[PDB]
């Protein structure tokens, strides 16, 4: 039933992030290249086509705590976005409102979380939301 320790799982995610996956519409990497705890990550999501998020690059901060991947990571958008599940004033992603986080499985990863957020951007309830001006970011 072998489990992979947090640190080694994150090492794997570090390598996958550098190799990139699929069409490159989501990407991730360490926020601090000298962070041996591999805790703080930078996430990137290309807004999907035919949505009000299109042609915009969203940057996010993903925090992988001590219990990751048994426990979901914390996520917040840096780039301002109007999207269900994202606190409109802080960019914080409400875990309970995002299925992948609400129903987290230890088989998930930063990649999966970013792909889920991008998929949710295509939802009927999100794709039509008027967005703030491009380039704005939340504080902290």
């Amino acid at each position: 039933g072998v489990k992979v320790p947090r640190n080694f799982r994150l090492l794997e995610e570090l390598e996958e992030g550098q190799k990139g996956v699929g069409d490159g519409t989501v990407s991730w990497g360490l926020e601090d290249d000298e962070d041996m705890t591999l805790t703080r990550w930078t996430g990137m999501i290309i807004g999907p086509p035919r949505t009000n998020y299109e042609n915009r690059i969203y940057s996010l901060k993903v925090e992988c705590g001590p219990k990751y991947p048994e426990a979901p990571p914390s996520v917040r958008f840096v780039t301002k976005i109007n999207m269900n599940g994202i606190n409109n004033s802080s960019g914080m992603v409400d875990a309970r409102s995002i299925p992948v986080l609400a129903k987290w499985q230890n088989s998930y990863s930063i990649k999966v979380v970013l792909q889920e957020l991008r998929r949710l951007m295509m939802s009927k309830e999100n794709m039509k939301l008027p967005q703030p001006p491009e380039g704005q970011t939340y504080n902290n």
Partner: protein, 149 residues
């Protein structure tokens, strides 16, 4: 139902027949996960320091090599900023009879004798090849800063 005899074997030899200058304890939740502490080798710029390392025995082990990484920041041509180790018995030259304690003293051996000439070396390598004297003092500086507590 548990671990392969081999893993039990080594795991027990460790918490029994300890490697000199190296501490190796099992994790409290993962029987394939070990918390290692390597004493800086005598006469090395790391002498006097203690370095944390983590070791994980993959499922497919012995086939696959064990995974090891430093958790203490160290200035060395073969250890990167994230503690990843460039040791070949860990990638290319790995095979089943090596076991764990071959890897451990080997890693200690790397500290005792850096390989700045390694293709995938650091950048610390550059400073080790060109100004070894300064590199050695910086390794000592980093030992004072990160490996004395």
């Amino acid at each position: 139902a548990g671990l392969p005899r081999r893993i039990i074997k080594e795991t027990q030899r460790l918490l029994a027949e300890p490697v000199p200058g190296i501490k190796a304890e099992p994790d409290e939740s993962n029987a394939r996960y070990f918390h290692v502490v390597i004493a800086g080798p005598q006469d090395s710029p790391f002498e006097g320091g203690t370095f944390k390392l983590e070791l994980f025995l993959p499922e497919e082990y012995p086939m696959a090599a064990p995974k090891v990484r430093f958790m203490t920041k160290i200035y060395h041509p073969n250890v990167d900023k994230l503690g990843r180790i460039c040791l070949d018995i860990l990638k290319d030259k790995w095979s089943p009879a090596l076991q764990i304690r071959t890897v451990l003293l080997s890693i200690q051996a790397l500290l005792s004798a850096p390989n700045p000439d390694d293709p995938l070396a650091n950048d610390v390598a550059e400073q080790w090849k060109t100004n070894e004297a300064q590199a050695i003092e910086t390794a000592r500086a980093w030992t004072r800063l990160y490996a004395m507590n």
